[PDB]
Design a protein around this ligand. Structure first.
Ligand SMILES: Nc1ncnc2c1ncn2[C@@H]1O[C@H](COP(=O)(O)OP(=O)(O)OP(=O)(O)O)[C@@H](O)[C@H]1O
Ligand SMILES: Nc1ncnc2c1ncn2[C@@H]1O[C@H](COP(=O)(O)OP(=O)(O)OP(=O)(O)O)[C@@H](O)[C@H]1O
Ligand SMILES: Nc1ncnc2c1ncn2[C@@H]1O[C@H](COP(=O)(O)OP(=O)(O)O)[C@@H](O)[C@H]1O
Ligand SMILES: [Mg+2]
Ligand SMILES: [Mg+2]
Ligand SMILES: [Mg+2]
Lengths: 542, 523, 15, 478, 52
């Protein structure tokens, strides 16, 4: 009973050394610390060499004493998978963190597995309509593809991932997994409560009719928890792909936080750091996680990952490494966002493998390439326009600057999830309407319309509606002079008649501060522990 | 030398003991004649192996917890960061010039904790909870940990209550929810502190008009500031009366970098007392960009590998595990809240810095304060195109929400036509209208220091500006015009607007009536 | 990429 | 040998005292290894696979042999991993023979000069930066330019030429896919099957989930599979897709074998990493068979920054350079070849003689196009011959555009640049020069392409016949 | 010294390109002048009724 129950050798932050006097646990095995305040799971990372394993803590190590009994579980971190996980919130180690009781486990799968083989792969390219103009036009999504949203802290990739949830995850009739990795806990509560409202998550005895399962490793978690919670969400998605055999939607908010968490951990593991500050194993840790997120021949996973860029730096090694793992990379720019254009999608930096005329049709492809040609030509003109003004341009250049400003504003779109703070109701723009409208603005059918008629509208019917409305108003600015409903006898009381209906409050004068406060008696001397573990005052010597 | 071959040396294989017995009769008398030179051996206590750079290596301390307050025998506290096989690396909350090699380290049995409670309310403490205001020890207080984990998903609810700041720009444009986190990001000397000070003074003004549970108890955490600045701020909070509700934690620029790293966690543990017992807290981390610099100092002195700009790599986790404790709790947890105002100084307006973009992707919004608006005298210099608060929106004052959408739209069009014409020669005379209205409104929103306004006197003041009622006044006398409007309007309508929550159509009628008998100074 | 910016400063200053 | 420690794909091994440097070792878990740094107290072994199955005290056996891959004509058609083992699900490699992956490149006396042309089918390449057999050519560009698409078009085009040439001058292609997705390379096996290029193609696939020593070693495995055709008198075409992803796999092992880091973190020997590999692409002498191996390393830059560490190494190793620009990509110019920065050091020595006399004029005019468009985009003034060169260079820029997977043979490329440089595509509007030149190939007689294929050169009895045939074509717009 | 002291301003600047010395500049300037003054030699023939 002593063997294969080892003891804590040294504790450095998220990283625990445990010495096992016989038959060491394997790498990736799960170990349980006995006597901690909470459940502390340690995942074995390395064998250090002297009957010592090197572990990663899945919770805080504050409170670990250097002899503590650590129990090997003989297997990796196994999380509950199945249809009974639908509608629940899980953490990194598969525990319910939504207070709905224990999780109905059809199976429990380890969170570490290999990627599917080369024979298992799927080469099928059908488009996924998102109802977003810039996404559907310029970098269209694949229905079994890895999709990345690249952004720089405040450019809108959580709002884009929520709009993609709202548009896609209702028509798509499968199950969803939301793996929240390293994001705000407030946003996890927001998504959970809005999914209970729209009936995607159902509580109580209706729980089996839920469509989404949430796995959360948010930014208050230690680095070991945020480094493995994406693997937990992957395991929940891979059960539905491999065993239920059906389509999954996996949304991962900030897969960068996985890399950042392993970079926090890797400093204390005794590794020589790679470029900018990262672990030497950035590409292989990221690739081992990303190659599990695929569609095989037996099921589909449509993946949407938000990717954070660290200082608006798209050449940082974590974004530059994760660019090669995606089928559609939607890059959000801060300069686009500062012009008020939302979604702040850089149209000359967002790519897809679907922008291919043999896949989307030559009409869509030619419109998209013509839109990109006009935008790139304006980008080449902007250095002249900023200095010499638009008065120095050619008439051909003035035409392409006007058309490119119109197609820059037309790529912006109101979102249904943004209407609670913008106030403008959102529009779902169909793909045929997107192609037709952008073709019309390309050919010069809508040069009659101003620039701001295109800003934050759905499709080209609404450009002409807004262009009639902006023009029509250009006159109507007055005749709110008299003939009011706000003179003194319309339905109005007097002001003192309004004062007496005020519910007077009683101000309590005592702050309620010592209601049930148990003040402990602080000592005016530092009380410490002597050699016998007994509480004594600090001895008066230096 | 294999461990298979070092394991067989536990078994005795000497086959002759002619000097086991020779020294075992002679070892104790030779040890006894050197007892003047033996320091007493150490097992559960600690002895300092080596101290330097504010990190001591401590031999022994066999039963210390990781992350625990240790006490050096000179009375300086420490924190056991990394327990190693041979030593314990402790981090010294103080100057290491008083720790010697061979000093005794005492375990205290408790992870790093500060005094929290009703009795720390009013006091000025250091980064670890000991008072520095000189008025004695912290009484009516209890000890709680500084590295509590933030509440989870199920322990929260969305922010609903509207947390008035007293700044017209903030309460109209960037409104603050009560469990929200709002970054005050700007350059050096752009009025970052002034917004947070105005919020604390306004909570003093509102705490005496609300019934005992809608009161907000502020905490100001001053990290890396000067001590004279902190003394002047305590003088201001005392003479306004705001020190009745404020805790003031200060780890100043002279203090050790562990104390500056730890002081926001100490202040957060003190304000989480008010979050956890159903009350509401306000916490201001002034220059969280200095806590990041102190943590970078600690990490490079611990020889951890530097990352971007030199920062340790867990400098995101430093601020994320700090600001995630600013929450709004659910009704099963009491319903208390904690609103955070992190402050980040920016170099030359570079929002794309490391710590700046870290804290932007933690907080629920931003308040950008520009040097080009601050030099022109537009104070608070709030960048309206960049400032944002999405969690506090549709959770603000309802009358202010009825008025301020027109204000956000009119400042938006003012920004559009100033983005078109930065030189004045081509006047459309409808572009001149939106220029005159925008110049009226940006004179309306700018205000003076250390005098926050109640929300009904801001609602009426921006009601009188987003409508007509001020176009008689030209561009200069608007600061006196709004004071004349606040003065000459009959003060019953402020009581109806406060009590009802929004402008009712009877109140809109009386308000359109009352804004016509106002003697504007521009005439 | 650090010499693209220095020559762009050169271009903007000569302009 | 006993495993002392294990972690991060490195196992420090006690014992193994007679092991060689670079020798394959075998763990008792079945997973293989390679002894990379032999030290006085232990062996540093990079693990060919997942290191979770290796424990402390596991037994390591040395195989006696340096790392080797199966080479031969039985690898043609198959999709292997970073060392030989086929991953396409078609059983073992029949008709194959093992040989080492680290072979010394042929020396001075083992070569001859690069004179035969390698037709890629991309006319921006085959005119302006032409490629001979035995030449290594870097395809360097930014993130999503047309880098793979240039290299896939060079492979598909060899299928179109292999049906038409005799058996001796057929080019057998090898595509090494380092660090890519596994479904990205499944899209290429599907493309090489439905074109038919998989009859001549080997794919060496070390994807992103493979271990870091399998991606470091896969360019050497693919070079060894392609050196079979070089050493036995045939012709090979090796494409190392992202050598910039092989060096990241090399940096990972070097930093975990505790070799001290250098520039950006890279080991000191990372120039020797790639120059060992690219110098194996050679045109052999006729004593050795006359065989050839043509390399196309791919390097990805970050923001068009070719001043990086791995970028400046491979620019210094290879002969030519095909620099693809992301700003030229979005202007419509696809292949996005920067004609001002793309070089070929073999040059006019090994291009088509029928296009040597046409594409000399083409780069002579496009050099004149570049500086005049920098001035005329300000919109100062124009000069009726400065107006001619930015109107002619727009005829040539649209001429060198191309679709995705249609390599144009060599004769239909040189007739099209003939019709663009001999004035036949003046007064045709610039929007449909990309649409006129299908008529210039379809309406011009299909038997004039046979003469320029058989002569290889525009004879005097052919320019007078071809320019008579470029007048009986119905051009759009006009 | 000729080009520097204004002595060869009568020549085109492309007659200096890829030549041996200053007499080959004059040997290329007159060669160039004959070449572009005799562009108009093949606008009338070689379109039909050639020598077979
Ligand atoms: N709203 C305001 N109206 C008038 N003056 C102001 C206002 N806000 C700040 N000031 C003045 O501007 C100066 C800078 O203010 P403040 O100290 O708030 O900026 P800061 O961002 O804290 O600078 P630092 O961080 O360097 O201390 C102060 O001296 C103050 O008097
Ligand atoms: N000549 C071309 N004409 C039209 N489209 C092209 C051409 N070449 C490439 N593309 C398009 O550009 C996209 C990128 O091509 P490619 O896959 O070659 O990128 P890459 O340079 O290999 O970058 P990465 O290695 O990151 O994929 C492809 O989806 C392809 O459709
Ligand atoms: N489509 C949109 N419409 C309006 N505002 C948006 C939109 N997308 C983003 N924003 C603004 O950008 C801010 C940051 O977006 P968010 O997704 O929260 O940032 P991040 O990209 O860091 O996750 C939001 O608070 C919102 O105000
Ligand atoms: Mg986010
Ligand atoms: Mg300040
Ligand atoms: Mg590629």
């Amino acid at each position: 009973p002593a063997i294969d129950a080892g003891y804590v050798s040294q504790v450095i932050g998220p990283v625990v050394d445990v010495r096992f006097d016989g038959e060491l646990p394997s790498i990736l095995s799960s170990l349980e610390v006995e006597g901690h305040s909470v459940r502390l799971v340690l995942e074995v990372a390395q064998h250090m060499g002297d009957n010592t394993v090197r572990c990663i803590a899945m919770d805080s190590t504050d409170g670990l004493v250097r002899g503590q009994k650590v129990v090997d579980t003989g297997s990796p971190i196994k999380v509950p998978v199945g249809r009974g996980t639908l509608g629940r919130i899980m953490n990194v180690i598969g525990e319910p963190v939504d207070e709905q009781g224990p999780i109905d486990a059809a199976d429990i799968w380890s969170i570490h597995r290999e990627a599917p083989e080369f024979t298992e792969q799927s080469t099928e390219q059908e488009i996924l309509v998102t109802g977003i103009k810039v996404v559907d036009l310029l970098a269209p999504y694949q229905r079994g593809g890895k999709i990345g949203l690249f952004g720089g802290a405040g450019v809108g990739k959580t709002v884009l991932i929520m709009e993609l949830i709202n548009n896609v995850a209702k028509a798509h009739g499968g199950f969803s997994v939301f793996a929240g990795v390293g994001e705000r806990t407030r946003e996890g509560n927001d998504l959970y409560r809005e999914m209970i409202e729209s009936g995607v998550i159902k509580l109580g005895a209706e729980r089996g009719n839920s469509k989404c399962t949430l796995v959360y490793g948010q930014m208050n978690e230690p680095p070991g928890a945020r480094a493995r919670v994406a693997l937990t969400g992957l395991t929940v998605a891979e059960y539905f792909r491999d065993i239920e055999g059906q389509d999954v939607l996996l949304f991962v908010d900030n897969i960068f936080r996985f890399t950042q968490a392993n970079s926090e951990v890797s400093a204390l593991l005794g590794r020589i750091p790679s470029a900018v500050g990262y672990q030497p194993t950035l590409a292989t840790d990221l690739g081992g996680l990303q190659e599990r997120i695929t569609t095989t021949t037996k099921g589909s996973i449509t993946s949407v990952q938000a990717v954070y860029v660290p200082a608006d730096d798209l050449t940082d090694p974590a974004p530059a490494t994760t660019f090669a793992h995606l089928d559609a990379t939607t890059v959000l720019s801060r300069s686009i966002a500062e012009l008020g254009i939302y979604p702040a999608v850089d149209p000359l930096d967002s790519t897809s493998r679907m922008l291919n005329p043999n896949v989307i049709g030559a009409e869509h492809y030619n419109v998209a390439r013509g839109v990109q040609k006009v935008l790139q030509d304006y980008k080449n003109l902007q250095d002249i326009i900023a200095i010499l003004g638009m008065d120095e341009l050619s008439e051909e250049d003035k035409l392409t600057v006007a058309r490119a400003r119109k197609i820059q504003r037309f790529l912006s779109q109101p979102f249904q999830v943004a209407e609670v703070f913008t106030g403008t109701p959102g529009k779902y723009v169909d793909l045929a309407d997107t192609i037709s409208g952008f073709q019309g603005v390309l050919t010069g059918k809508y040069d009659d319309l101003p620039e701001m008629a295109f800003y934050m509208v759905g499709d080209i019917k609404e450009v002409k509606e807004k262009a009639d409305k902006m023009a029509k108003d250009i006159a109507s600015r007055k005749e709110a002079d008299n003939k009011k409903v706000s003179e003194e006898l319309k339905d109005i009381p007097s002001l003192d008649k309004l004062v007496s209906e005020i519910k007077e409050v009683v101000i309590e004068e005592d702050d309620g501060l010592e209601e049930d406060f148990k003040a402990e008696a602080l000592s005016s001397e530092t009380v410490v522990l002597n050699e016998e573990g007994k509480s004594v005052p600090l001895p008066k010597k230096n | 030398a294999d461990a298979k071959a070092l394991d067989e040396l536990r078994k005795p294989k000497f086959s002759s003991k002619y000097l086991i017995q020779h020294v075992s009769q002679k070892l104790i008398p030779a040890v006894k004649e050197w007892e003047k030179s033996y320091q007493p051996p150490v097992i559960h206590l600690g002895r300092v192996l080596s101290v330097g750079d504010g990190i001591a290596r401590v031999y022994g301390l066999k039963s210390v917890q990781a992350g625990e307050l240790v006490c050096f025998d000179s009375g300086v506290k420490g924190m056991a960061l990394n327990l190693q096989a041979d030593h314990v690396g402790v981090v010294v909350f103080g100057n290491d010039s008083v720790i010697h090699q061979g000093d005794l380290v005492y375990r205290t049995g408790q992870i790093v904790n500060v005094p929290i409670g009703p009795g720390t309310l009013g006091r000025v403490t250091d980064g670890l909870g000991q008072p520095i205001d000189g008025k004695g020890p912290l009484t009516n207080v209890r000890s709680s940990l500084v590295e509590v984990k933030a509440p989870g998903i199920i322990a929260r609810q969305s922010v609903r209550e509207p947390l008035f700041t007293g700044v017209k720009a903030v309460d109209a444009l960037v409104p603050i929810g009560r469990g929200q986190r709002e970054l005050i990001i700007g350059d050096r000397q752009t009025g970052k502190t002034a917004v947070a000070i105005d919020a604390i003074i306004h909570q003093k003004n509102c705490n005496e008009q609300v019934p005992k549970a809608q009161r907000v108890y502020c905490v100001y955490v001053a990290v890396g500031q000067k001590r004279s600045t902190v003394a002047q701020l305590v003088k201001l909070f005392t003479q306004t009366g705001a020190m009745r509700y404020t805790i003031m934690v200060s780890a100043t620029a002279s203090d050790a970098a562990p104390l500056q790293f730890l002081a926001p966690y100490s202040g957060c543990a003190m304000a989480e007392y008010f979050r956890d017992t159903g009350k509401h807290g306000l916490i201001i981390y002034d220059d969280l960009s200095k806590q990041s610099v102190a943590y970078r100092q600690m990490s490079l002195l611990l020889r951890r590998p530097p990352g971007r700009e030199a920062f340790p790599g867990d400098v995101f986790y430093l601020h994320s595990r700090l600001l995630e404790r600013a929450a709004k709790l659910s009704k099963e947890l009491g319903g208390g809240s904690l609103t955070a105002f992190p402050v980040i100084e920016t170099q030359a307006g570079d929002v794309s810095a490391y710590i700046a973009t870290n804290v932007i992707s933690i907080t629920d919004g931003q308040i950008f304060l520009e040097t080009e608006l601050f030099y022109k005298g537009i104070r608070p210099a709030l960048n309206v195109g960049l400032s944002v608060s999405r969690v506090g929106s549709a959770a603000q004052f309802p009358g202010m929400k009825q008025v301020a959408g027109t204000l956000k739209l009119e400042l938006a069009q003012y920004r559009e036509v100033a983005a078109f014409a930065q030189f004045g020669s081509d006047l459309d005379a409808a572009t001149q209208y939106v220029l005159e209205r925008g110049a009226r409104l940006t004179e309306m929103l700018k205000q003076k220091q250390f005098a926050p306004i109640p929300i009904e006197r801001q609602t009426v003041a921006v009601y009188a500006a987003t409508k007509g009622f001020l176009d008689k006044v030209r561009v200069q006398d608007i600061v006196a015009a709004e004071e004349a409007v606040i003065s000459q309007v009959n003060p019953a309508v402020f009581k109806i607007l406060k009590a009802n929550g929004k402008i009712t159509p009877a109140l809109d009628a009386h308000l359109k009536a009352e804004l016509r008998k106002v003697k504007l100074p521009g005439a | 990429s650090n010499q693209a910016v220095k020559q762009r400063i050169r271009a903007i200053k000569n302009i």
